């Protein structure tokens, strides 16, 4: 009797990613640079989020060829991803052997009302969230890992900070909240109460939660850890930088030694040019989940 | 095979489920006419006073007794048991009075004291979850009566030929062994009348 | 002996189906109710129509009255408490009350949080207007449900609205595409796990009774026709001309709700029913959360 | 074969050109039969009294209905509160000839009317416009009436309604066939019913005037405006001499184009019910 | 006695299209590619929807020459499509022998209030819908087949998904709904009650319902089937792709084997460039029906 | 009793309905593997070109022929009939080529000419035949028994295990022909 697809296995895989950096890659070269730099995994896609923004149009699941290409190039896990609600894309990525699926708001959503019923899969999913209600809904749908949404491709952490702060603050409230108030809390949050109950019983969120969106510098990366992220996703900030390879090492090392300011200072030293980024004054981009 | 459930009040639907789950046909009986053509009858859990009140008002008493006289097996659960009993503590007169037993209504207390407990049932098997909801108990059993189960030295299940009775409500569990056991009695009774 | 299991709490309600539960203010009434065939009695200080007419703050009944009622009858005794009033509920429990009604006809004690019914041994019944409301009460530990209606009005319209709503939302959820539930839950304000239980089971997992404005045998049979599991009646029997006669009729109609000849007969001699109230009420009832 | 649409509707077609009178007891019923009523509507209180008393208005006590049935050889109508399926079943079980699912009673279902298709006994329903009419027909209504404003002694609403419905029928009858589906939608109507109307060249059920009919002139006016007949409740039994009113309404209804006669019939009448102007906040028009 | 133009014949023709792909074609070459790829029919038009969008102007019925051209090139059915309300265009397409007419919102509507009285024709019509009310109105006008509206030429399935989900959910409600609630339902939906009654009696929608609008990838195609489509319409996503002929085969094969994720993954592999598509932020385009 | 329906394309669901309504079990066949253990097969109405194109691409041709060789009864409706035919007018090569018949595709015209007409079917009277862009049987071999004609055209035929028609019975509520096929299956299972 061997058991696959258990919540424990799905979530465990995420617990094994903690303390590290997951990097968006468009090709094998990048993937190799990421593995070399110390990435704990790579997220495979057609265009980096900053480019997805700049190009516009409809963003879909990557070509399987690219994914296979990336898989062949590295010994660390390969993530990819899918459009919100796109069940078949996810089935495809699963059939390809992808290690973790990102049902992602950076791609063009396929279902604006219903996310994927992630419970039905063997491969685990990571989803974005802005608050504990959103988080709990994703978890109820079967998500096994979470990340802040941020504002991807902007080079601006502000949103990721907002989200990490919000979610962490709402967890703290729920953990110490009077037991009789949870059902009413759940309703105010738009949350499933059972998840809040699990949170309260456990004393923490029952899945890993990463920072993602606008992480551009070693200081950015260490900040999210300081604010309680379990790890960081980086896409644009490394491969839109002057020397990706150099950024990659610095982010990885700052993530790990996030309390060593002398080191972080050193690692920040020679970096050179970072991606320009975007202030805001955007009308509709991102925060597309339900 | 056609099993009636006395549908005047109570947990009728639960019995129907069991009956159908064991492959028999269920018939809800709110009227004397509906007794005709049935191979057996179930008297469900509910409120014995309510069932009696309704039995009286619509003249079901005699036709039920005729149904019994015809030799048709009858299964009484909780209130069901109370309807069958010959004697009821505190009662000058019984309801059907077809089973040579004395019962005490509400003997375990009130709903707060309602409980579940695993049982050993002679003909049926073991570890049968008994659910006791404001249950009565059998104080005294006649010689013709075979005791099928006890809980803490109280008689909680009994058979008397065609008549089957219990304090608890098996229809609230997913366990159908007792229902099967009753159906058997019906089969034997049915085959027996050639 | 395992007590206070969900199966036991809920089972007790399954044992009330098909019947009428009557509001009673004293033992005389309680005896009439038992005699008439009630499956239980709900004990209170004032009947809802009077609660309305008197106004003021409506609380848990004097324990004396409850004990009085308990001693007078062999059927279960319900009572119920003000919304959120944990201690009242503990008290009714300590008295041996069979089923607690955390009730919107009383003056709510907590306007944001209901009682955590899970923590008790004795079961609770709660009112609801829609499946979201239902599912929240169930998540709080309610073991039985009823429509809210508009109590003391002699008008079924609200109870009908509610029974219809809840039943329609159950049918949707039972046949709904599985992947749409989380989003549905959110729209309804429901706990998804309950909707999932509903879907898995193919029906609501607790008993649901009609309550509010049931005034005539036809009203009683109608609620059964609309899928109620049973009826609560307070004002319409003891504010009628002959309670004792009403009582029998409601009981018998509830049971034989498809026998229109019989219902017609039972409706015949009734005489005067409570006048009731149209509407044009500013704030009354629908106080739950 | 019983309960066919043809039978249900036919019964109404047999009521045309006549007056149906609200009665609270057998005496009244006998007066109505004597006066020439084509049927009588049995209730607990007359609409004007329903208004004045307020409270919750339900189906009448069966005793009263039986009482009335025993007193007359003309059909007896009664009902029920809107949506009240069981009340209707009860009236059916009593032998009532036509059920009025009525807005003058306190509605029991504010969203769904009775599924009249499931009954053997026919129903009459009120309407203010063809959409409303068509919905009631689609629910199985076999006869219609204007809603008016009952108990006011004021025909203005009944006139409005009869006019509206008749004007909308005329439009549909002569409308370009390819515009019906879009019309139905504008009206809130079932298209099949509008199609039936157009195919037939007229409404497929009888439509009566009801609400505020107070005088022989009132009664003849509704016929003039194309009513199939009239319902009268308050205007006869809240009048000075019911028995005299009753004959006059019946005779005016029948001879609605004989103005000399109507004038004569109007002559000695004496005091009519006072009635109510308007300035009512919520009363009536409760259907869906 | 041979009876033509019966509802059974009109609808049957659509029942014979199930499980397949219907492809938009502008010429015979394309039509032959479509037939070769396994299309169950071809929809003939002047410009593909993506081009209709990009060009703007007034879009009308195609030149009969082109339609004849396409008819002569293939043995599978030829559809074409007309402007909404354009009775004469439809008569013309009927006179030409067109097998199914699409009264289409992608063309510029001729009648903004009234659709064609389809009942008066012998040749069947397909119409678009976003919800059951819309559906039922088209059916009441005589439509014999339906499709989602989507947002054509965008390469984005989101709308088609919304529509398919909505219609399917509303069917389910009606099928299991309490009989006495239909008249009031019909009114809420803007539906003809007789159609809802037919649906309820039958236990399903009494006409075929296809997905259409934004179908761009084999995964997109299989998704619609997964959501309960009876088949798919594809226009832009095949002939605006890098290799139409290769896309065509893949969509056809994915549509048929919509639950075989290994296969779909394979079929998705070599595809190469898909049409870019459009996010949204469109002011008025499409959803023009009544 | 297990009846396959060739589920690559076309009016699959309709046949399933009939099959289940006659008390048999329906199995949708999109893959060779799914042929194993079946007592008979139905080739549904749809698009013969599409069906062939899919049959080729997934190597179903040989396994179908093996299925025929095994003596399993096969029912072809419209396109279904086209797949069975030995000869197709205008076609150098047929599809399965299992029935000794010549068929002409789209012989009644286009969809506009699609029609319904009551039929007399030998083994199976007044059977409503629905002809949707139907083909017709030009010529039948000696081994073939003609079961029905429409205006002097052969529209239904049997050849031992093989059953074929131009029309689509699965679009009607009338199951007589489905029953008649099931019978053939029942008789065949025995040998």
UniProtKB/Swiss-Prot annotation, chains A, E:
What is the name of the protein in this document? Answer: Pyridoxal 5'-phosphate synthase subunit PdxS
Please name the pathway. Cofactor biosynthesis; pyridoxal 5'-phosphate biosynthesis
- Kindly state which keywords UniProt assigns to this record, in alphabetical order: Lyase, Pyridoxal phosphate, Schiff base
Gene Ontology annotations of biological process type: amino acid metabolic process; pyridoxal phosphate biosynthetic process; pyridoxine biosynthetic process
The record, for PROSITE patterns, names: PDXS_SNZ_1, PDXS_SNZ_2
The UniProt record gives the binding positions of D-ribose 5-phosphate as 24, 153, 214, 235-236
Q: Which family does it belong to?
A: Belongs to the PdxS/SNZ family.
Query: What residues does D-glyceraldehyde 3-phosphate bind to?
Result: 165
The source organism is Geobacillus kaustophilus (strain HTA426)
Organism ancestry: Bacteria, Bacillati, Bacillota, Bacilli, Bacillales
- What does the protein in this record do? Catalyzes the formation of pyridoxal 5'-phosphate from ribose 5-phosphate (RBP), glyceraldehyde 3-phosphate (G3P) and ammonia. The ammonia is provided by the PdxT subunit. Can also use ribulose 5-phosphate and dihydroxyacetone phosphate as substrates, resulting from enzyme-catalyzed isomerization of RBP and G3P, respectively.
Q: Which domain of life is it from?
A: Bacteria
Swiss-Prot record, chain B:
- Specify the domain of life of the species encoding this protein: Bacteria
Q: Which residues form the signal peptide?
A: none
Q: Which UniProt keywords apply?
A: Glutamine amidotransferase, Hydrolase, Lyase, Pyridoxal phosphate
Q: What are the binding positions for L-glutamine in this chain? A: 46-48, 105, 133-134
Q: Which Pfam families match?
A: SNO (PF01174)
Q: Could you name the Gene Ontology cellular component terms for this entry? A: cytosol; glutaminase complex
Q: In which pathway does it act?
A: Cofactor biosynthesis; pyridoxal 5'-phosphate biosynthesis
Assigned EC number: 4.3.3.6, 3.5.1.2
What reaction(s) does this enzyme catalyze? aldehydo-D-ribose 5-phosphate + D-glyceraldehyde 3-phosphate + L-glutamine = pyridoxal 5'-phosphate + L-glutamate + phosphate + 3 H2O + H(+); L-glutamine + H2O = L-glutamate + NH4(+)
- PROSITE patterns, per the entry: PDXT_SNO_1, PDXT_SNO_2
Entry keyword Transcription: no
Identify a single GO molecular function assigned to this protein.
glutaminase activity
Active site positions, chain numbering: 78, 169, 171
Q: What does this protein do?
A: Catalyzes the hydrolysis of glutamine to glutamate and ammonia as part of the biosynthesis of pyridoxal 5'-phosphate. The resulting ammonia molecule is channeled to the active site of PdxS.
Q: How does it assemble?
A: In the presence of PdxS, forms a dodecamer of heterodimers. Only shows activity in the heterodimer.
Q: Which family does it belong to?
A: Belongs to the glutaminase PdxT/SNO family.
Q: What name does this protein carry?
A: Pyridoxal 5'-phosphate synthase subunit PdxT
Its source organism is: Geobacillus kaustophilus (strain HTA426)
Name of the gene: pdxT
Swiss-Prot record, chain F:
Query: What is catalysed by this protein?
Result: aldehydo-D-ribose 5-phosphate + D-glyceraldehyde 3-phosphate + L-glutamine = pyridoxal 5'-phosphate + L-glutamate + phosphate + 3 H2O + H(+); L-glutamine + H2O = L-glutamate + NH4(+)
Which catalytic residues are annotated?
78, 168, 170
Keywords from the UniProt entry? Glutamine amidotransferase, Hydrolase, Lyase, Pyridoxal phosphate
Stored PROSITE patterns: PDXT_SNO_1 (PS01236), PDXT_SNO_2 (PS51130)
Write the Enzyme Commission number(s) for this entry: 4.3.3.6, 3.5.1.2
InterPro entries for the chain: Class_I_gatase-like, PdxT/SNO, PdxT/SNO_CS
Q: Which CDD domains match?
A: GATase1_PB
Q: Which residues bind L-glutamine?
A: 46-48, 105, 132-133
> Is Lipid metabolism given among the entry's keywords?
no
Q: In which pathway does it act?
A: Cofactor biosynthesis; pyridoxal 5'-phosphate biosynthesis
Lineage, top-rank taxon, reads Bacteria
Q: Does the keyword DNA-binding apply?
A: no
Q: Name one GO cellular component term.
A: cytosol
**What are the protein's GO molecular function terms?**
glutaminase activity; pyridoxal 5'-phosphate synthase (glutamine hydrolysing) activity
Q: Which Gene3D superfamilies match?
A: 3.40.50.880
Its job: Catalyzes the hydrolysis of glutamine to glutamate and ammonia as part of the biosynthesis of pyridoxal 5'-phosphate. The resulting ammonia molecule is channeled to the active site of PdxS.
Question: Which family is it part of?
Answer: Belongs to the glutaminase PdxT/SNO family.
What HAMAP family does the database record attribute to this sequence? Answer: PdxT (MF_01615)
Q: What is this protein called?
A: Pyridoxal 5'-phosphate synthase subunit PdxT
